[PDB]
Amino acid sequence: GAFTGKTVLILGGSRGIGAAIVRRFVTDGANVRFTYAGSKDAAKRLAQETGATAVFTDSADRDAVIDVVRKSGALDILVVNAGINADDIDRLFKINIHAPYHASVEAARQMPEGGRILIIGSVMAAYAASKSALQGMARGLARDFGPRGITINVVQPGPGQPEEVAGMVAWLAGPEASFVTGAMHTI
Amino acid sequence: HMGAFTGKTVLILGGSRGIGAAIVRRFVTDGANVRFTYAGSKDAAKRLAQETGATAVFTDSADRDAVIDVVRKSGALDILVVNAGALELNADDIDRLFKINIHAPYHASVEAARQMPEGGRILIIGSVNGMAAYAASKSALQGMARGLARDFGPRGITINVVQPEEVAGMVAWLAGPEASFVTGAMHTI
């Protein structure tokens, strides 16, 4: 496969876009581990189908996110899938902004040069702030970890779709996108 | 004396130091009833309050509930000013940064909009210039201003971001009569 021998970690990979990304990297011969929270049964079936390793992790819980990344050693590719009241808004910010930041920083300091960090945006006005934040974060991270030979890209899906997003993710993780970083890609 | 904002109530989140203090002075000069929140020195906040004749109240901008509460306690305010803003940062301080620069401006603006009359003015002050956390926060504010303007538009409430006395002047102008149609934009000084 195109990613044979590569170590991949996918946060929030049990369902939808996340699951498609898991399937894509496994099909391309990569060693894949992914995380899940509420959907245990979905993660179980995905692990059974692909052979990928599933680990429970609360994406809203910051320390859990940092821990699961840290325990993954020198990963080659990190994928952070955001997924889908004042508490609802704060939850949205933690998944769209906080979790991708902490995971990316933790991963980047463990990655070899050529490492790829990929963030999948979530699918009122907190959304506009979240999307904008990810675009800004992509630019900032690229500046920060560019000298390390690490690329950072955001894939923002529209309001099937998972397979197409996974294709974009795979391309961005590949050799043809080595000079593409600090970007948000709308698909 | 009376001025441009006589009879108007202004709430300034984080107006104890720097740009915040300048904005406090400017609105008092323009005759407004000014209240501001402080996070650090009680002595400095009390000093500024007595010097300017403004109200000072403690509030940690990182605390969502405290931010929402202090806005609610302000009643039917006319102008809201949210003043946002090391070798290595720990995870908690990063989350604090995001809460101060992203969470607080959102919740404060949303809560203030529920209390404002037509013509109400919301003004967010950006951080003074690892870059990633800063870049994300600045971009977030720009996207937030546009998104909230659509929600606040039919209410007659405008919202703008001022990204850094020059700031205080731009703040007072955006809060003035001429900028009644100006909303949802980020303005660099």
Author numbering:
A (entry chain A): 2 to 85, 95 to 133, 143 to 178, 204 to 231
B (entry chain B): 0 to 84, 91 to 134, 142 to 176, 207 to 231
Quote what the paper states about this structure.
The structure of BdcA reveals that it is a member of the short-chain dehydrogenase/reductase family of enzymes. Using two complementary binding assays, we show that BdcA binds specifically to NADPH, and thus is highly likely its endogenous cofactor.
The SDR active site consists of a conserved catalytic triad (Ser-Tyr-Lys), which is C-terminal to the cofactor binding motif, Gly-X3-Gly-X-Gly. In contrast, NADP(H)-specific enzymes contain a basic residue within the glycine-rich motif immediately preceding the second conserved glycine, and/or in the loop after the second β-strand. These residue(s) are responsible for binding the 2′-phosphate. Furthermore, using isothermal titration calorimetry (ITC) and thermal stabilization assays, we identified the biologically relevant cofactor of BdcA to be NADPH. Previously, BdcA was hypothesized to suppress biofilm formation by binding and quenching the secondary messenger c-di-GMP. Furthermore, BdcA does not contain any of the well-known c-di-GMP binding motifs present in other proteins (GGDEF, EAL, HD-GYP). Furthermore, because of its demonstrated role in biofilm dispersal, BdcA also represents an attractive target for dismantling biofilms.
